[PDB]
Write a protein that binds this ligand. Structure first.
Ligand code: Y01
Ligand code: Y01
Ligand code: Y01
Ligand code: Y01
Ligand code: Y01
Ligand code: Y01
Ligand code: CL
Ligand code: CL
Ligand code: CL
Ligand code: CL
Ligand code: CL
Ligand code: CL
Lengths: 475, 212, 475, 218
């Protein structure tokens, strides 16, 4: 009767409230631990580099950086490759399959959550070109399937709420998380189920915002709705006209082509790894070698970079002065030392002329292949943030080129085109458009920017699908 | 019009702001804000407070263009951004000992450069004088963060920042004295060796799988 | 047969693009004509009042105001009562019925669109306590069913795109429009259909924003995504913590209780109108009398208001000075002369000392009953904006009391509670909660406020359903 | 050292000193003209002197004085003086040539003086509004017409302010007329307003009652 239905229904809302609360807490734990561990690692590296800069022996600083990257990834890859291989990657395809209806072994076990959270912490601290936002979706699903109603029909509904809560916590987009659970579900419309999914999604982003606020002491300020916060786009500089619509469509073509190349190289690389690097010992060695190479390539770019500009208010978290004048700090070092989320935010909101095209171009080309190489490693890590960083990097270069070509026109704001470039790369790579589109508006907090973003994403998807077919036919 | 006793607070504030604005300009190219006319700012804020303490209603918010308000806000904003409080003691009556110590060190560092001008001599005569000045400036930076609990180390008193930037520009841009030890060959050898590891690993795994 | 599918699908996207374009154009036509006609009407009334203020004869100004209100509503009610009775109301229940599956006659005929657009223009210009945003949903549905695929299933999908485009144009919430079409549809998930709904909704809000900018002269600032634009909520004063969450829950109870009284009063009033005012002639007379009373009740409040404060820059368009010092406009006059959308914006964003509690309280009490009395009229008009205005009015009063009771505490910002009060009244009146909340986050462009908005809206619905059950039982 | 970093270049030292006393004069004249507001009619020569001096210093001393350091005192001070001029809005009521007050402003100030001096000798406040009422009426008509001239000749925005000295002149007159003199115009239209309002409010009562009574039988 109604008494039995209401008793069950309130427990569903109670459980989905815990799913959102715990998903936000896990995101807080990941963000706090990564920030403290990466800060400790970069302070050691920066201190060692500064000691050897004038006395000599910078090769030891490179060795220390590579060893520190390898040591963290060694732990982060051993636990994934040897204990729970299911934790490898962002875990979204496993979650998509679970919501589809096919059960992959060891996806929603409590051991997977521990390894996924530990793996993503060590992988991000390990210096790999990865992002921690992607695995947060898998973490929410495991919390939902463990906290929860011991039957398949209810469990899938809870997992959808957990996955939605993970998306909301990762990007601060509670509506985008609900959309993500909706399309992956692709079932009959349930008003109550969609309601408790929304309740879990919004509880999740509030818990992340609230707990991080008390961590920063700034309780009277809630400015961290997600793991990555794009900032505020309420600027006359961040305004577009109808004449820029064809330009934005062109960026989608670039994002679709680059995304197809990103997937093409990663596809051939994946086939190589399946045939030859399938043994768990080899996967651990490969992940360690990638981490060592990532530090080596970063050091070489920093060492050979001759462009450095004076410290701003918050340009660098760890300003590295190397071979140039006192009071100035390496610009290329800031690209690698700063967190990828911080780099994306700075690219989105920066006055024109803040980035030298040469150092930004070199970083974009190197990071594009490092991110492509890093995906597929037997580590718990995502690809959304590297995709965002790659797109924002070349999107800013597109804005820089437009300003040069149009005589520093007002409408040619590099920051605006960085946002368009970030969407184009995300669109051309993940090929998920609806939930992605809602995420950008919620991240940017600008409805008017939805229309160019929607066009850019739509262009990237159709171009990427056509180009992927063409590349495979040529091969 | 106001009372004759109410026109004296405005007139006193008028010449007080006139002379403060005069010092702000004539102490701008070599920035000497917080050490030249720190009392003039104190005199202005005291004279404004005198009005706040029977003329506040008829002078402060008596009209839309609150000239007295906006001028005091501008002077306060300039004082805050210049961080002139950091230059003076907590009592804000004279320059702090650390600032005074830096200022004479800055004078001594500039005293080096004139002697060794008549650029090879400058770089190898009293380089430690520049080194100790930079050590103090970095020391005062971290002390400033730990004193007022500022989250980053960004902005000191503008007198100190300008004094060091003049020294740094002289030592690096005008003089070519910075000589960092660059081990390009060891860096290349180590970086090449590490970058050559994935080639070995991918080839060895490919060849090991072949022929089992 | 992929070629046939592609040709059919591209035509669906082409049609859905026209639905969004035409829905935005209709919103532009409604907004442009209403502001020009209401501007002409208020200039005539203001000029007449200012002429008789000193020489005497203000009763003639009251007669002119009542006659002008009656004349516009007489035309707006004759075309609805005598020609197309289906166009009466906001048309939301008719669209929900159509999307449900049961077809009501003449809902999606071209004549209905002409009557609906003309009726909403005349009713808003006629001074009725109504809003033009609500009927915009019905207008989009009729455009979709006329532009369009001559079969029932395709018609329902296209109409849902038009309804979604109506919500996006009305409120600048393209995602909220998609959500509104999904629940009112309540069918199996369709990835491509939800794409066309999202495409049409997103085009609609861009077309309205783009064309209005052309009309407003300046073009490099698309500052009007929808018919009603809340503004920007990025202020230190506009922030909250956990301690204010229970306060928001209490305000949700007030919104639900007031919303229940709003529905209960309108239910008994509707029962009277069906039994006794069912003739088309009586419906026209009733609408005319309400318009005359609305002008008269506005006049006596403006006449008897002793509260007038000087012009603090903008915030009006027709500053009426009555019986007080020169250079000061009457505060109560600005409440009625200003458009309800503009009044809502001013309530949301204003210094904590801008509204007299007595003046705002008297307006809220009168406007609450005027809006309740005006709902059942045989005119084309919505109730969303009046409910927002009522909620923002007493929400601001709640914030004013909090400042008094907490010694002008920084967390008791009246503007923040005006937004929360606006949601409480809107949620407790329409009881539509999942689509409504998404609109608020899109309207305010602040995901951090989604959580208090969610709790306030959820609280209002729960107490609203309980109270109407109790109130009906008592009767 | 080069005469750039540690010490001022003699060419730039004199230019900075010239801008120093020009800014000192403007700030002193700004304060002493704050109340009553005679800002834009007395400080216009000083403001032009400052902006001319800044232009002279900025196009051989632009790079060594303006952006030579973080705290650009010369830049921020000129920005503040410019901001004060714009918010005071003396651009509109200064002539296009900008050597003196426009004809409108001169015509307003002398009427404002005439209105005020008329108030002074009517005290020794019933006699003030009994006799000096047309003087206030024509001055207020001019100010209302001045707004419309600003909305058309300038065409900035509805509700845009004129120069603050003109606005303060009217606000002083209005405050004198309505607050201290307490000269208010009585209204005897309350009774006709109530009679018409009651009649209109009573119409829906008849309409609803008549409909109910008519439908009571057949
Ligand atoms: C700052 C932090 C977040 C860095 C992460 C380092 C450790 C806290 C992590 C890394 C590896 C983790 C371990 C990985 C695997 C296991 C085995 C697991 O035991 C089993 O039940 C499985 C045993 C098996 O089958 O081998 C219990 C958790 C534990 C100890 C984990 C505990 C947490 C560890 C030590
Ligand atoms: C063997 C395969 C698998 C990898 C080959 C890698 C090379 C293409 C890279 C690795 C190290 C790189 C070098 C690292 C550092 C330098 C020093 C750099 O010289 C400076 O700018 C020195 C002064 C300064 O520090 O600014 C010029 C580039 C160069 C030779 C780089 C050239 C390109 C090198 C040889
Ligand atoms: C290239 C720069 C600008 C960015 C830094 C990334 C590289 C250090 C990575 C990216 C992709 C990697 C490559 C991906 C795949 C291969 C193929 C692999 O096997 C073969 O070449 C033989 C295969 C066969 O015989 O079938 C050898 C390593 C290599 C070149 C990898 C070496 C390291 C690469 C070049
Ligand atoms: C400022 C105001 C007073 C201007 C008037 C605007 C509207 C009130 C007018 C303009 C166009 C008119 C429409 C023009 C054409 C028609 C078609 C007409 O249809 C018929 O010929 C059949 C009528 C029937 O038999 O029911 C019905 C009236 C209608 C909708 C008219 C209704 C009244 C409208 C909307
Ligand atoms: C018959 C039913 C259906 C309607 C009853 C309506 C009354 C309750 C309203 C209508 C007009 C109102 C009056 C409108 C104006 C005034 C003038 C007001 O006092 C003034 O003279 C202030 C005006 C001024 O000088 O600015 C005191 C309230 C009063 C009598 C109001 C009292 C309440 C009245 C009579
Ligand atoms: C606080 C007020 C001044 C705000 C403005 C709104 C009123 C002018 C409106 C709102 C509801 C209206 C009322 C709605 C219903 C009725 C009941 C109706 O009478 C009956 O139905 C009698 C039934 C019977 O005798 O059985 C007479 C009109 C009246 C009072 C209406 C008169 C006008 C009212 C009071
Ligand atoms: Cl995966
Ligand atoms: Cl990912
Ligand atoms: Cl990621
Ligand atoms: Cl309806
Ligand atoms: Cl509405
Ligand atoms: Cl409505």
């Amino acid at each position: 009767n109604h008494t039995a239905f209401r008793t069950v229904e309130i427990k569903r809302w109670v459980i989905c409230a815990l799913i959102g609360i715990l998903t936000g807490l896990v995101a807080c734990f990941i963000d706090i631990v990564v920030e403290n561990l990466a800060g400790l690692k970069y302070r050691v590296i920066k201190g060692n580099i500064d000691k050897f800069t004038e006395k000599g022996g910078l090769s030891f600083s490179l060795l220390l950086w590579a060893t520190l990257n390898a040591a963290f990834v060694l732990v982060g890859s051993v636990i994934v490759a040897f204990i729970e291989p299911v934790a490898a990657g962002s875990g979204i395809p496993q979650i998509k399959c679970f919501l589809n209806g096919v059960k992959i072994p060891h996806v929603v076990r409590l051991k997977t959550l521990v390894i996924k959270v530990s793996g993503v912490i060590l992988s991000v601290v390990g210096g790999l070109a990865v992002g921690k936002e992607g695995p947060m979706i898998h973490s929410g699903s495991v919390i939902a399937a463990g906290i929860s109603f011991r039957r398949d029909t209810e469990k899938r509904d809870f997992v959808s709420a957990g996955a939605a809560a993970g998306v909301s916590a990762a990007f601060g987009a509670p509506v985008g998380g609900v959309l993500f659970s909706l399309e992956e579900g692709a079932s009959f419309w349930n008003q109550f189920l969609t309601w408790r999914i929304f309740f879990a999604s919004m509880i999740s982003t509030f818990t992340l915002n609230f707990v991080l606020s008390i961590y920063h002491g700034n309780m009277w300020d809630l400015s961290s709705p997600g793991l990555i916060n794009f900032g505020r786009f309420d600027s006359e500089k961040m305004a577009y006209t109808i004449h820029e619509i064809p330009v934005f469509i062109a960026m989608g073509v670039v994002g679709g082509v680059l995304g197809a190349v990103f997937n093409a190289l990663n596809y051939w690389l994946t086939m190589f790894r399946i045939r030859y690097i399938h043994r768990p010992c080899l996967q651990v060695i490969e992940a360690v070698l990638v981490a060592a190479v990532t530090a080596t390539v970063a050091f070489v770019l920093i060492y050979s970079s001759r462009d450095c500009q004076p410290l701003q208010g918050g340009s660098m978290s760890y300003p590295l002065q190397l071979f140039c004048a006192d009071g100035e700090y390496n610009s290329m070092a800031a690209a690698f030392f700063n967190t990828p989320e911080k780099s994306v935010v700075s690219l989105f909101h920066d006055p024109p002329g803040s980035y030298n095209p040469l150092t930004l171009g070199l970083f974009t080309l190197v990071y594009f292949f490092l991110a492509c190489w890093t995906y597929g490693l037997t580590v718990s890590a995502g690809v959304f943030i590297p995709s965002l960083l790659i797109g924002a990097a070349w999107g800013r270069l597109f804005g820089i080129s437009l300003s040069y070509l149009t005589g520093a026109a007002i409408w040619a704001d590099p920051g605006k085109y960085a946002l368009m470039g970030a969407a184009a790369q995300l669109g051309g790579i993940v090929r998920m458009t609806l939930s992605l589109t809602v995420i950008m508006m919620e991240a940017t907090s600008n409805v008017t920017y939805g229309f160019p973003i929607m066009l850019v994403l739509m262009t990237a998807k159709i171009v990427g699908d056509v180009f992927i077919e063409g590349l495979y036919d040529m091969h | 019009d106001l009372d004759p006793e109410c026109r004296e607070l405005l007139l006193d504030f008028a010449n007080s702001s006139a002379e403060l604005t005069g010092c702000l300009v004539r102490s701008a190219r070599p920035v000497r804000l917080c050490q030249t006319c720190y009392p003039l700012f104190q005199q202005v804020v005291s004279k404004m407070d005198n009005i706040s303490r029977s003329c506040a209603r008829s002078l402060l918010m008596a009209d839309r263009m609150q000239i007295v308000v906006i001028l005091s806000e501008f002077f306060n904003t300039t004082w805050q951004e210049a961080n002139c409080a950091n230059c003076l003691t907590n009592n804000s009556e004279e320059l702090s000992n650390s600032t005074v110590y830096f200022l004479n060190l800055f004078n001594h560092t500039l005293t080096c450069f004139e002697h060794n001008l008549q650029y090879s001599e400058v770089c190898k005569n009293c380089r430690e004088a520049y080194k100790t000045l930079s050590s103090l400036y970095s020391e005062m930076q971290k002390m400033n963060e730990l004193e007022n609990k500022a989250e980053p180390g960004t902005h000191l008193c503008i007198d100190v920042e300008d004094a060091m930037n003049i020294t740094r520009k002289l030592w690096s841009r005008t003089f070519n004295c910075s000589v960092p030890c660059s081990d390009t060959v060891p860096v290349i050898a180590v970086s090449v060796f590490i970058l050559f590891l994935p080639v070995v690993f991918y080839l060895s795994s490919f060849l090991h799988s072949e022929q089992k």
